[PDB]
């Protein structure tokens, strides 16, 4: 419809990992952001560089909707500025990002029992990422001086990881569905 | 205070399905926030887990137990349920309705202990 | 499915003495070990999380201690009313077989 679709990243019935971590373009559209930022308490929300109380009032060239999972205590990651596993080797924002982070405890539909092994993170890497860059390869990281040649063993560690949510975990364990919109589609 | 009391009856024929309520009394608590589950003891035996609910279709079920065991939350009516189908002689325990204790926010331990208790129900499966 | 084995499965101890119970696991469990304590005609009662931190409302003469595979519940100065049995119960993963058989503490004057 007319309306801008993010009826399809928030309401989604499965998130990528924060590794491969998806982006949604969204041009051509119109919004109510007031409407759909008007979240209740259990929502963490912050913004960067714009005010929310101002986006039904302003026009941008796009629209990118960025969405994927971490566990509570990475929360804090995904900012501007930070440091950390998650935003140096999976998801970093530039410095002067301009947008809004959401993020809400996922634990009724991304934990299982026996443990959610399905969400990922990388663990190592050789640099840290560029801003909004998305590295999906997961060859053998080489932490030594031999080559690995593919080949796991010693100081050759596959570079990524598991969250393995079950629901008995405590909060800083539990997963989070993280939506990050980037302005640069009017609202109304 | 949280408050746990089992209510069921205590006689079962064989084959048929056990049906427990254990109600949930407390300090306007909503059972939403609370994972809640089953513990039964057969007469001079140890303590079993029967399962857990944690949310809608997040359940624990005792593999032991097969596919005959359903647990179901009412968050508006603050009481939880079992149901344990084909009953047998194996079945005659004193049931305890117990709520997990909610983990530390550091916490990453895949199962939990159980640190407020019903007061148990004695079923006892005969014809 | 980890098995946890209670030793002994009976005690008999005088009052004011210094009671130890220990719980093995069959593969290391970290410290995700609960204590409970069962008076006859009672529920159990939690004493016991994290294999030694205490419940609130518990007597501080209970401790516990132990990581990995072995684990031990202390009960000093015992007291008359302490007589019970005693479980413990891993919980670093929902698996069959969670609660150790348990140990009758049986009170002698």
């Known amino acids: 419809t007319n309306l801008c679709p993010f009826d399809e990243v928030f309401n989604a019935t499965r998130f990528a990992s924060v590794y491969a971590w998806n982006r949604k373009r969204i041009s051509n559209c119109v919004a109510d952001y007031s409407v759909l930022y008007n979240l209740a308490p259990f929502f963490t929300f912050k913004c960067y560089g714009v005010s929310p109380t101002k986006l039904n009032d302003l026009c941008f060239t796009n629209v990118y909707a960025d969405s994927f999972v971490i566990r509570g205590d990475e929360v804090r990651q995904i900012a501007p500025g930070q440091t950390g596993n998650i935003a140096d080797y999976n998801y970093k924002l530039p410095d002067d990002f301009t947008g809004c982070v959401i993020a809400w405890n996922s634990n009724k539909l991304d934990s299982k029992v026996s443990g959610n092994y399905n969400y990922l993170y990388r663990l190592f890497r050789k640099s840290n990422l560029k801003p909004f860059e998305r590295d999906i390869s997961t060859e053998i990281y080489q932490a030594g001086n031999k080559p690995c040649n593919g080949v796991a063993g010693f100081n050759c560690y596959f570079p990524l990881r598991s969250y393995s949510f079950r629901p008995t975990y405590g909060v800083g364990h539990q997963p989070y569905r993280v939506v990050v919109l980037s302005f640069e589609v009017c609202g109304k | 205070q949280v408050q746990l009391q089992e209510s069921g009856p205590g006689l079962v024929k064989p084959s048929e399905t056990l049906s427990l309520t254990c109600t949930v009394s407390?300090?306007?608590?909503?059972?939403?926030?609370?994972?809640w589950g089953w513990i039964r003891q057969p007469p001079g035996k140890g303590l079993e887990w029967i399962g857990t609910?944690?949310?809608?279709?997040?359940?624990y079920y005792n593999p032991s137990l097969k596919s005959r065991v359903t647990i179901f939350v009412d968050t508006s009516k603050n009481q939880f349920s079992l149901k344990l189908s084909s009953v047998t002689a194996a079945d005659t325990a004193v049931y305890y309705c117990?709520?997990?204790?909610?983990?530390?926010?550091?916490?990453?331990?895949?199962?939990?202990?159980?640190?407020?208790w019903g007061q148990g129900t004695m079923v006892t499966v005969s014809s | 499915a980890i098995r946890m084995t209670q030793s002994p499965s009976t005690l008999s101890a005088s009052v004011g003495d210094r009671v130890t119970i220990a719980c093995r696991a069959s593969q290391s469990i970290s410290a995700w070990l609960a204590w409970y304590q069962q008076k006859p005609g009672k529920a159990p009662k939690l004493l016991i999380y994290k294999a030694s931190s205490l419940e609130s409302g518990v007597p501080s003469r209970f401790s516990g201690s132990g990581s990995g595979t072995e684990f031990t519940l202390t009960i000093n100065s015992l007291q008359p009313d302490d007589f019970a049995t005693y479980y413990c119960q891993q919980y670093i993963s929902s698996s069959p077989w969670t609660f150790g058989q348990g140990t009758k503490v049986e009170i002698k004057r």
């Open positions: 407390g300090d306007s608590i909503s059972s939403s926030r609370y994972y």
């Open positions: 609910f944690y949310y809608s279709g997040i359940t």
């Open positions: 117990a709520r997990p204790r909610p983990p530390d926010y550091y916490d990453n331990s895949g199962a939990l202990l159980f640190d407020i």
